[PDB]
Structure 1
Amino acid sequence: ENLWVTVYYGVPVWKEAKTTLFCASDARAYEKEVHNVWATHACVPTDPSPQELVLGNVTENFNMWKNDMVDQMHEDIISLWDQSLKPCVKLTPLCVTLICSNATVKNGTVEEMKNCSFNTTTEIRDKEKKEYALFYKPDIVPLSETNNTSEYRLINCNTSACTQACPKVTFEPIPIHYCAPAGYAILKCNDETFNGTGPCSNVSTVQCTHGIRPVVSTQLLLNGSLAEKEIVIRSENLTNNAKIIIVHLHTPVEIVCTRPNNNTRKSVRIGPGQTFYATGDIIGDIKQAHCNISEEKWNDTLQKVGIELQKHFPNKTIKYNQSAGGDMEITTHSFNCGGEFFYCNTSNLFNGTYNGTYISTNSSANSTSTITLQCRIKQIINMWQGVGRCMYAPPIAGNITCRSNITGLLLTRDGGTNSNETETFRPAGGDMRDNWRSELYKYKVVKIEPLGVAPTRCKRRV
């Protein structure tokens, strides 16, 4: 019997391709005012359902490191954030000669912050007035061409100009659901041991992704999701030491940070109408800003990450080392907390090692042991490199706490030599692409092609 071509519509057929993507928000921003924050006003309302629609017989490729969605969200966040700072004051009347503090107390036997005073363009243009405020040390630079220490400057005025984040906005990581426009499908990889490349044998589809946390953080991925079964490790290729290596945790290590200086808010005003905020007198006796982690949890989790590294390096044992130097933004763990921008020295979390021997760390014999990290504070955030950088984070009154869960470590295998049989890993820097990519490995968007062609025994009438 003869055969005629027959066209089928409504077919499932896929092609991975670039596409614009919605933003959809969860319920915990719709109680605020409009634009406090973007998720309440711009992003479309979500829907909890449908859940992941299981697929009976699928077989799909999943390259994660070339996933375009990171770029489609990197540019999204850069465009969104840089538009959020538009209406606020563009500082500019602060690039002024700061003539300031008296002698430091007891030559650094103190958790110091420096006081400074300066001349401002008051509400009348040509009748300027003197004013006093205080700043944390990283945001002041010596000015004088000589050794003279009397006169100081903001760390800007050499880089681009700045703007003050308005008090209206909030930095809390409101989750964002990504949803593809109609005509595209979000396919979710579900292979529990998926490393990052190759196929996913069990795959599903969803209308919109489950909410991701957009939190900025360099060395530790705060407030993240959890691996369902076990610790897993990812890289584009482990042979390249320069590549970032992500680690994802099953058991969440609990981290708590605080800045117990009872910092107080002050409201200077600049030119017509628009205010500028700065730290006033500290009430109380000053104390260091710090972060706390339970020691037994960290030891057990680091040893378990040791065995997971040994799964790819059974030939060699594992050591951990201090960061790879550089400036402040790259050396230290830096994460946002309630309004401030914490920066924390990470040496005390990366000084252990593992040599095959899993020690009897748990169950707890005495839970009182806790490690401590010394933490500095900043206000002038050179936020992304070459972006229109310096945001001024306003100083927030009252003492703050950011009790949170660690869920992923960004590391780098050392660029050493001498054929060490106990190879060592450092904390990595954080490209925020890499921060966001770690929480987004599960998803891929595919083009739907609902036109079909196949043979069938038909012959239409004439």
Structure 2
Amino acid sequence: AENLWVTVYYGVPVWKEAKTTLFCASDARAYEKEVHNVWATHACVPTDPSPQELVLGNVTENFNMWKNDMVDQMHEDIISLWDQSLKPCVKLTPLCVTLICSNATVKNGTVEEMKNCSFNTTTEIRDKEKKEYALFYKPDIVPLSETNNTSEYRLINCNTSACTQACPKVTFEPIPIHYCAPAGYAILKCNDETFNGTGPCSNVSTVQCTHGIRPVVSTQLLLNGSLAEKEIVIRSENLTNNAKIIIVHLHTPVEIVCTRPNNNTRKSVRIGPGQTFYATGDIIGDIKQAHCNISEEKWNDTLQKVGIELQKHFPNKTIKYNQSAGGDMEITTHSFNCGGEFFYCNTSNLFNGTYNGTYISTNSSANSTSTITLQCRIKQIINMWQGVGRCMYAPPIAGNITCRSNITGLLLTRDGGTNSNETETFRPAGGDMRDNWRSELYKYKVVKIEPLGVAPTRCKRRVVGR
């Protein structure tokens, strides 16, 4: 026929995989009220993006959730907004005086994970102090730095670092967030369910935006998120090594209930030139330990079905389920925010009762039964992001604190390896908020469009003046 000819095409469909910044898009309805939402502040674009998709067909590419740097980006975005959210607000510093301490003397009784303490502050007038008292959890208030007197205490943190009381307006709702990319990138969904965290995703879509991710903070359990309607999907960067973290998607939402059966009146002290510190006062006669609830067969039969995946990913052996083996309450309990206070629950009791994960098929199925009930610590001084970001005091909330969630997945490790001969254990794991992000983001990837391409074709020429 002829020589082939170079021909230029613009807006051609091809891409490469690459790093970038992204937009925080939001549901638009928040910043009517929620200027300084602690995560997704009013700095996120009020949008509610239309959730448009094309499952491509004939596409062929590998995904790797553990390498999607959006995980890290999100972890940065979170911590950035955290430090933004606390900046306007008042330090504990003037309240770092010697504390003289006693009991939570209420209804002819006492609250044993708490203390009462007495202290002085200035009024608005510098030369004028008076005297006042309040209650605190024992993790908040440490016996004083010198052993002179059992009744003497201090703030836990103040020998290291000042921390702020959050301003009351600044809002802790973990609202739905949309990630959306700027022009010349696009987001690719791995729609290929049974994608096991790495491999060829045979089935991929373009999308302009993600679903509404919630930034729920947690320590061992995954909440309110990635329901794997396929399977109780078990994942890791390498399940074959116990040094790695393990993700489990539940196949179904599993409810949890949690209560403070302990009913504070918020004591409110004017400190310095017009600032109020908020604290524990008297307690209305609901006065018992905080706790949480799930039904036994719900928990059990899930852990059994988990065991089926574990003896699919491992050859047949007796895996067992057991407590988080060490660290502080932060590591070893499950911890939550109950839409106000912070909770620290007995998941070490919850991880028990177990035969070989699969071979609990010796039961397989049963009628429904009572709640497994887990006791919980509460406390108000927090080094939030595992010591990363500003340390904070959470102001207390009066009245009828009680809350509910769904377990939607889990964070685990296997145990330490003995001879492991036909036998193993697995345990709930402390991890990173990155692991919540991995569990919520695996099905997304970000790519760079290159619109340029050249091809042979027999445009016989563009002869001069043609």
- Do these two structures clear the TM 0.5 threshold for a shared fold by scoring above it? yes
List per-residue Cα deviations over 1:102-146 (Å, max 9, x = no partner): 599999996542111111122111212211111111111111422
Counterpart of 2:11 in structure 1 is 10
Structure 2 Cα separation of the partners of residues 263 and 361 of structure 1? 47
What SS does the aligned partner of 2:285 have? coil
Structure 1 residue 169 displacement after superposition? 1.6
Structure 1 residue 402 displacement after superposition? 1.5
Q: Is the 8 A contact 1:268 1:277 kept in 2?
A: yes
What SS does the aligned partner of 1:283 have? strand
CA separation of 1:120 and 1:49: change in aligned 2, threshold 3 A: same
What SS does the aligned partner of 1:29 have? coil
What SS does the aligned partner of 1:402 have? strand
CA separation of 1:4 and 1:331: change in aligned 2, threshold 3 A: same
36-45 vs 165-174, greater mean Cα deviation: 36-45
Structure 2 Cα separation of the partners of residues 312 and 364 of structure 1? 23
Counterpart of 2:70 in structure 1 is 69
Structure 1 residue 430 displacement after superposition? 2.7
Q: Is the 8 A contact 1:32 1:40 kept in 2?
A: no
CA separation of 1:389 and 1:331: change in aligned 2, threshold 3 A: farther
What SS does the aligned partner of 1:435 have? helix
Q: Is the 8 A contact 1:381 1:389 kept in 2?
A: no
List per-residue Cα deviations over 1:43-93 (Å, max 9, x = no partner): 112345242212121112101101110111111111111011000102211
What SS does the aligned partner of 2:198 have? coil
CA separation of 1:409 and 1:394: change in aligned 2, threshold 3 A: same
101-110 vs 258-267, greater mean Cα deviation: 101-110
Structure 1 residue 287 displacement after superposition? 0.3
Counterpart of 2:455 in structure 1 is 454
What SS does the aligned partner of 1:74 have? helix
Structure 1 Cα separation of the partners of residues 211 and 223 of structure 2? 18
CA separation of 1:439 and 1:64: change in aligned 2, threshold 3 A: same
CA separation of 1:28 and 1:111: change in aligned 2, threshold 3 A: farther
What SS does the aligned partner of 1:93 have? helix
Structure 2 Cα separation of the partners of residues 106 and 165 of structure 1? 31
Does 1:89 pair with 2:90?
yes
Structure 2 Cα separation of the partners of residues 158 and 420 of structure 1? 49
430-439 vs 381-390, greater mean Cα deviation: 381-390
Structure 1 residue 388 displacement after superposition? 4.3
157-166 vs 195-204, greater mean Cα deviation: 157-166
Structure 1 Cα separation of the partners of residues 145 and 108 of structure 2? 22
List per-residue Cα deviations over 1:18-52 (Å, max 9, x = no partner): 11100011255244253356646221123452422
Structure 1 Cα separation of the partners of residues 58 and 18 of structure 2? 22
Q: Is the 8 A contact 1:25 1:40 kept in 2?
A: no
Structure 2 Cα separation of the partners of residues 367 and 105 of structure 1? 38
Structure 2 Cα separation of the partners of residues 93 and 225 of structure 1? 45
4+ residue segments displaced more than 3 Å:
33-40, 102-112, 356-368
Structure 1 Cα separation of the partners of residues 149 and 81 of structure 2? 43
Structure 2 Cα separation of the partners of residues 106 and 396 of structure 1? 20
413-422 vs 202-211, greater mean Cα deviation: 413-422
Structure 1 residue 190 displacement after superposition? 1.1
Structure 1 residue 387 displacement after superposition? 2.8
Q: Is the 8 A contact 2:305 2:358 kept in 1?
A: no
Structure 1 residue 450 displacement after superposition? 0.4
Structure 1 residue 419 displacement after superposition? 2.7
List per-residue Cα deviations over 1:192-222 (Å, max 9, x = no partner): 1111111100000110111101010011112
Structure 2 Cα separation of the partners of residues 243 and 112 of structure 1? 35
141-150 vs 262-271, greater mean Cα deviation: 141-150
CA separation of 1:367 and 1:361: change in aligned 2, threshold 3 A: farther
Structure 2 Cα separation of the partners of residues 29 and 286 of structure 1? 35
| TM-score (norm. length: structure 2) | 0.93
List per-residue Cα deviations over 1:204-253 (Å, max 9, x = no partner): 01101111010100111122231121111111112221110011101221
What SS does the aligned partner of 1:27 have? coil
Q: Is the 8 A contact 1:300 1:361 kept in 2?
A: no
Structure 1 residue 307 displacement after superposition? 0.5
Structure 1 residue 389 displacement after superposition? 3.7
Structure 1 Cα separation of the partners of residues 26 and 100 of structure 2? 47
381-390 vs 344-353, greater mean Cα deviation: 381-390
Structure 2 Cα separation of the partners of residues 123 and 361 of structure 1? 70
Mapping for residues 35-46 of structure 1, pairs under 5 Å: 35-36=36-37, 39=40, 41-46=42-47
Does 1:295 pair with 2:296?
yes
Q: Is the 8 A contact 1:218 1:435 kept in 2?
A: no
CA separation of 1:390 and 1:371: change in aligned 2, threshold 3 A: same
Structure 1 Cα separation of the partners of residues 232 and 367 of structure 2? 25
CA separation of 1:447 and 1:313: change in aligned 2, threshold 3 A: same
CA separation of 1:303 and 1:356: change in aligned 2, threshold 3 A: closer
Structure 1 residue 356 displacement after superposition? 6.3
Q: Which runs of 5+ in 2 are unaligned?
A: none
Structure 2 Cα separation of the partners of residues 112 and 9 of structure 1? 68
CA separation of 1:358 and 1:448: change in aligned 2, threshold 3 A: same
CA separation of 1:389 and 1:44: change in aligned 2, threshold 3 A: closer
Identity %: 100
Structure 1 residue 330 displacement after superposition? 1.2
Structure 1 residue 420 displacement after superposition? 3.5
Structure 1 Cα separation of the partners of residues 348 and 57 of structure 2? 49
Q: Is the 8 A contact 1:28 1:174 kept in 2?
A: no
CA separation of 1:365 and 1:228: change in aligned 2, threshold 3 A: closer
Structure 2 Cα separation of the partners of residues 314 and 302 of structure 1? 17
CA separation of 1:424 and 1:149: change in aligned 2, threshold 3 A: same
CA separation of 1:107 and 1:343: change in aligned 2, threshold 3 A: farther
What SS does the aligned partner of 1:149 have? coil
Structure 1 residue 418 displacement after superposition? 2.6
What SS does the aligned partner of 1:198 have? strand
Q: Is the 8 A contact 1:220 1:409 kept in 2?
A: yes
Q: Is the 8 A contact 1:320 1:353 kept in 2?
A: yes
After superposition, the CA RMSD in angstroms is 2.4
Structure 2 Cα separation of the partners of residues 274 and 107 of structure 1? 33
Structure 2 Cα separation of the partners of residues 11 and 380 of structure 1? 55
CA separation of 1:363 and 1:385: change in aligned 2, threshold 3 A: closer
CA separation of 1:313 and 1:352: change in aligned 2, threshold 3 A: farther
Q: Is the 8 A contact 1:184 1:446 kept in 2?
A: yes
20-29 vs 56-65, greater mean Cα deviation: 20-29
